[PDB]
Write a protein that binds this ligand. Structure first.
Ligand SMILES: Nc1ncnc2c1ncn2[C@@H]1O[C@H](COP(=O)(O)OP(=O)(O)O)[C@@H](O)[C@H]1O
Lengths: 197, 145, 326, 346, 342
């Protein structure tokens, strides 16, 4: 069902499409629905060859790998396929502006982090969409979430949970965020870390 | 945001019914070798690195992680990524994800220290050469008189 | 006079010629030495001596595999610990052992990442307090008013050491992550709910006296953890020092004064050579350079006079070696 | 005479040391002043652009905005006022005898970076406006050198301002416009409808010639001298607003304290950075490496200057046509992030 | 436009720490690069000439020559590449970061057994290479991307002092009074020619401009594209030579001298061509402008430097990517450099 809804969003917010474009779009949606929970590189290769076999056998097309499929609506008014170097340059300039405006941190733009930004943007674009970033420390999870939230106009709220803090503080900050979300019509993006539980 | 998905709290977050059924799980994982090679190249290509001769070695295709070795930069990014992988292998971390923060910190320390050392070495050699030249000029002037 | 001045610089000319001969070697192998230095500075902080040596030999093999060269006689102290810094550290109160020198060098050379002093002996708090004089402040995670006092320390900008670091309080996460909001010529940091102003000379230190303690992964990944344990050489030289100062106190004091004078003379000779090279670079001068090498000859004569006391100490070391090893 | 449309290709290429932040045109001499993100302030010739006339480094930070003014009096030069992230507003003198630059005075007081600086002359008393991240719209005096007034009209920081007579508006980061009366220092009305910060906002001066959006509707708006204001945000859109008529020191009207978006232009692909007004045409640049040209009557794009630069198009500038002291030449200059500036001639 | 003559008085006077050996000009910016005898590079703003924008210790010995080129890639970003050659048996290649006005060392080329005297940079369709002459009597051709060697040959018994490059053809002049035109990949001597009795200082091609000395004569010369050459030696003369057409992989036959110019009083050092005019300096502190068409000296500049004069520089006029600015720059031995603008 999530795959169907993602295909609907991509079709509705997209330009005129061809059959190869439908295949690429459906494969990207399958990648973002089924293959994100995968952990192993062997499992990723198995999923890639499975997608090869499925498309070849049921739909009688370029490379379909994860880094070769970048669907985004950042570069235009529609959710279309984008190139690589132009997207990297645009996100470089946007990150330089973000470092100028909010906080300075020296991170280097590369392929996998661009793909992760695109999928985080896709997840946060959905209505009632929530994420569970799972990865090693200092990989760039919360700062990427902050950058994508700034790109989409989301307000950033981080709970100030620390030592000698109880459930009353958590309820207070949650109620404040809820009131800001509803009464003040301010789009907020709460970020809960593992250390904040 | 989950750092170690093996601990009890993170296992409770993952195995909770509605959190799993509502959130789009995006497994970042540890960085793979291509990502670390790319970021290492992109943050060491701005330093004076290749200033001596270099002979390309003979290594296996799967043993090298970057493009085939041409300059000092490919060699140093390969040696850094391979040593980081070996160091994580020696610490017996298991299936626990490996933080690449040590790699980034070491690479920043490397670029800063190589810049400082290259500047100091060039200044010292210029000083010793101008001193030797001044001594030779003084010797020539003394021999002329 | 000119002939005498030229003839008076024969040893320095030989040293300059040897340095120019060795420049090709020391430039061909610079990248490897820098690689090993960076690996020491970023990885081997939280390791023991045997594990450090094991990853040293595998890193030497791996570095030689990719046809990049290094120094065969490379040592971390000889590469990073400058002699003036060594003198300052020894005068502050840190021991003469080399492992502690390596760890003090890795601590006082990380200006980008805050260090984690894992010191069970609880004396590096006072040696770091001695390094910065009376301007330092001692904080802890178990004191009321810690937030306000840390904010005042940030506004003042003094060197701050936080003890009991295994009970980490996550309100300083913006200071651990070193993310700064640059507001013109002032730098602000949001701590808690109200921001503060960084004085620019603010330095943070976290010290924990609990081996095998518990620290958050967020704290662990961004803080250079360094261990501090007593190895065989430290206890051996400490036992030797105790037994020598309990056997012959005046003789021990004379030996300590002798070695301090020797290393001070070596530092003065190095500074003297640097000053002479700098003075000759920018070119009265002849009489000045005469005074320079007269001071050099006096220092050499003083060292040669000081040479005639060391075999006695070697004999005492050979005598007390059994006590040290037991 | 007024409906001139620039060609499909730029007339000439100007190379700058770093990213171009602002460009302005001398109202009399055909020369162009180009800002520089490195901090320099160039001054090029529209006919001999191979070598610059003069350029000096006056800031340690990036120059943010600038504008020119050919001074006139009731009793006679050109003045350039420069913004910078260095917390200073450096005012310069352009001497035409030796075609050089001479720094005059610096205006201090802001506690952070400034964003836009505007200058205007009225009854031989020229004033310099300013706006910073302190969300304080401080207005100085050029002749005296000291401050005149200071007020905070927004919760978050302002980004651009515009003046017309005694009224000043200011777009801000919190996506709200606000009209504040300068002599009285109080707000009149607010604007709402954006969910991205305002990049550039400017007034719509009336013209006597027919254009739908540059003519008064009622006699009250003709007496006020202003009816329309245009704001460009990061919503990839252009909005023409309606300012409600205040009850007149002017008194705010609680029943009419809100704006009204009469028209909402759309068609860009990224943030609109800078906007301009010329005749019945709306000239706007954006981060799509392109410049559009909207029509005020219909709201349709009539030309697409695709791939004008290889990067973001940070700024463009025209000549003011409402003012009788400035001849509205058919010259439009643009500046980009790709260290290039394109000048359009004829 | 292309017929500009520098004024009698210089427009900018720049001071440095030691003698100036190589002066180059930014093809796109009003920035001048100068090299000193201490192996130091100074990057100077034109309108702010007192304080150096950039100052770097490039080499431990004296720099001899320097060349610049703006890269052009059709894919990737462009940047300015500067090359420095010195007496350290090394060649250094830097990228000029114009974002913050600071040099950045890209790489180095090693392999020459003695000092290197001249290094050139030219761009192919999508690749860049570099040539070098040394005391080893060896012309060596390296590439900027990989860094390892592509060509090496010994064309002359004496040591080559100046190389010029166009396309796949190399003209080199040595301490011996002869020149040589060779082919780039094959490394064979297509043509030689003598006519001097003193060592050559600078030799370079004469390109085609869309004129007596810029026009192809026959259709058999237009397709090849190379017709003329210019050379200068310590003979106080500047010689315009004609090239023999090789039998086309080329197969090699002697040089023809079609013009000579005289009037210098000491050793000349540099040759530069702008449109119809020729700019040359000679060690009597004399900067002379000669006309190629008429064939005589037009204007002189004397006592520009108290000491000797080392080099000039003007922008390339025969390249599309380089704007022929109305400006000129020169250096001297007395820690002085002159900039003529407009
Ligand atoms: N692509 C990258 N290049 C360089 N550094 C990075 C990159 N991604 C993350 N980092 C480092 O990680 C830090 C941010 O990680 P963060 O998202 O805060 O980790 P966590 O999610 O565990 O809180 C930064 O200080 C940065 O130095």
């Amino acid at each position: 069902t999530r795959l169907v809804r993602g295909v609907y969003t991509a079709i509705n917010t997209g330009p005129r499409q061809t059959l190869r474009s439908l295949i690429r779009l459906w494969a990207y949606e399958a990648w973002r629905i089924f293959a994100d929970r995968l952990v192993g590189v062997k499992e990723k290769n198995s999923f890639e060859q499975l997608l090869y076999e499925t498309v070849d056998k049921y739909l009688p097309l370029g490379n379909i790998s994860s880094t070769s499929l970048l669907f985004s609506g950042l570069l235009s008014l529609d959710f279309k396929e984008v190139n690589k170097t132009d997207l990297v340059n645009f996100i470089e300039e946007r990150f330089k502006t973000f470092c100028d405006e909010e906080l300075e941190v020296p991170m280097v733009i590369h392929e996998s982090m661009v793909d992760h930004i695109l999928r985080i943007d896709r997840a946060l674009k959905q209505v009632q969409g929530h994420m569970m970033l799972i990865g090693a420390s200092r990989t760039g999870k919360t700062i990427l979430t902050r950058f994508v939230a700034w790109l989409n106009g989301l307000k950033i709220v981080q709970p100030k949970i620390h030592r000698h803090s109880n459930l009353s503080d958590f309820d207070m900050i949650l109620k404040k965020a809820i009131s800001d979300c509803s009464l003040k019509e301010s789009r907020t993006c709460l970020i809960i870390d593992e250390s904040n539980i | 945001t989950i750092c170690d998905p093996t601990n009890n709290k993170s296992s409770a977050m993952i195995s909770s019914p509605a959190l799993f059924n509502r959130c789009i799980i995006n497994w970042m994982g540890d960085w793979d070798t291509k990502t670390m090679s790319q970021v290492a190249n992109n943050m060491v290509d701005v330093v004076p690195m290749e200033f001596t001769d270099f002979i390309v070695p003979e290594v296996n295709k799967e043993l090298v992680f970057t493009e085939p070795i041409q300059t000092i930069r490919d060699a140093v990014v390969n040696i850094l990524i391979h040593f980081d992988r070996n160091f994580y292998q020696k610490m017996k971390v298991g299936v626990n994800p490996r933080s690449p923060g040590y790699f980034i910190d070491g690479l920043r320390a490397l670029v800063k220290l190589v810049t400082a050392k290259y500047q100091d070495l060039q200044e010292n050699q210029r000083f010793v050469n101008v001193g030797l030249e001044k001594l030779n000029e003084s010797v020539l002037k003394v021999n002329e008189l | 006079r000119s002939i005498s001045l030229v003839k008076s610089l024969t040893f320095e000319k030989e040293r300059w010629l040897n340095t120019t001969k060795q420049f090709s070697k020391t430039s061909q192998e610079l990248i490897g030495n820098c690689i090993i230095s960076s690996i020491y500075e970023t990885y081997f902080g939280h390791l023991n001596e045997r594990e450090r040596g094991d990853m040293l030999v595998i890193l030497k093999r791996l570095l030689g595999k990719f046809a990049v060269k290094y120094d065969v006689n490379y040592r971390f102290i000889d590469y990073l610990v400058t002699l003036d810094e060594k003198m300052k550290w020894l005068e502050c109160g840190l021991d003469k052992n080399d492992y502690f020198l390596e760890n003090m060098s890795i601590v006082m050379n990380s200006q980008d990442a805050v260090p984690f002093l894992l010191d069970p002996s609880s004396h590096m708090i006072t040696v770091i307090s001695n390094y910065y004089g009376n301007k330092t402040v001692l904080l802890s995670f178990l004191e009321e008013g810690f937030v306000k006092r840390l904010e005042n320390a940030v506004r003042f900008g003094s060197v701050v050491i936080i003890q009991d670091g295994e009970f980490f309080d996550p309100i300083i996460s913006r200071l651990i992550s070193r993310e700064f909001n640059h507001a013109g010529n002032r730098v602000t940091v949001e701590i808690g709910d109200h921001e503060v102003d960084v004085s620019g000379d603010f330095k943070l230190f976290i010290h924990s006296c609990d081996p095998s303690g518990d620290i958050p992964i967020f704290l662990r990944s961004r803080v250079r953890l360094v261990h501090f344990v007593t190895n065989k050489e430290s206890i051996e030289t400490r036992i030797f020092d105790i037994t020598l100062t309990e056997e012959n106190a005046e003789m021990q004091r004379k030996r300590e004064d002798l070695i301090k004078l020797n290393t001070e003379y070596r530092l003065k000779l190095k500074n003297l050579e640097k000053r002479l090279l700098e003075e000759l670079n920018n070119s009265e001068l002849m009489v000045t350079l005469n005074n320079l090498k007269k001071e050099a000859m006096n220092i050499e004569k003083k060292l040669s006079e000081s040479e005639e006391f060391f075999p006695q100490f070697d004999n005492l070391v050979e005598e007390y070696s059994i006590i040290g090893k037991h | 005479v007024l409906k001139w449309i620039p060609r499909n290709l730029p007339s000439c290429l100007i190379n700058v040391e770093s990213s171009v932040t602002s460009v302005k045109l001398h109202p009399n001499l055909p020369i162009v002043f180009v800002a520089t993100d490195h901090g320099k302030l160039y001054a090029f010739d529209l006919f001999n652009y191979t070598i610059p006339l003069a350029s000096l480094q006056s800031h340690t930070k990036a120059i943010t905005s600038m504008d020119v003014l050919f001074t006139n009096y009731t009793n006679n030069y050109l003045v350039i006022v420069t913004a910078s992230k260095d917390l200073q507003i450096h005012v310069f003198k352009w001497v035409s005898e030796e075609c050089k630059f001479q720094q005059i005075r610096s205006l201090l007081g802001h506690e952070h970076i400034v964003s836009a600086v505007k200058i205007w002359q009225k009854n031989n008393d020229v004033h310099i406006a300013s706006c910073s991240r302190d969300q304080t719209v401080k207005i100085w005096d050029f002749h005296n050198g000291w401050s005149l007034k200071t007020f905070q009209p927004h919760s978050q920081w302002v980004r651009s301002i515009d003046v017309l007579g005694d009224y000043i508006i200011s777009g801000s980061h919190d996506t709200t416009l606000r009209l504040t009366h300068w002599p009285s220092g109080n707000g009149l009305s607010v604007g709402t409808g954006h969910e991205f910060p305002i990049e550039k906002v400017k007034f719509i001066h009336f013209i006597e010639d027919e254009i739908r959006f540059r003519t008064p509707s009622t006699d009250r708006y003709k007496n006020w001298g202003m009816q329309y204001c245009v704001s460009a945000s990061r919503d990839r859109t252009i909005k023409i607003w309606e300012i409600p008529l205040p009850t007149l020191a002017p008194i705010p009207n609680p029943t009419d304290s809100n704006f009204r978006c009469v028209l909402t232009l759309k068609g860009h692909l990224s943030w609109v950075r800078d906007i301009s007004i010329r005749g019945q045409y709306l000239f706007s640049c954006a981060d799509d490496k392109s410049v559009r040209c909207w029509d005020l009557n219909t709201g349709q794009c009539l030309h697409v200057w695709e791939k004008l630069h290889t990067g973001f198009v940070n700024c463009l500038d025209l000549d003011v046509d409402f003012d009788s002291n400035v001849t509205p030449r058919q010259m439009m200059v643009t500046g980009g992030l790709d260290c290039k500036s394109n000048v359009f001639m004829r």
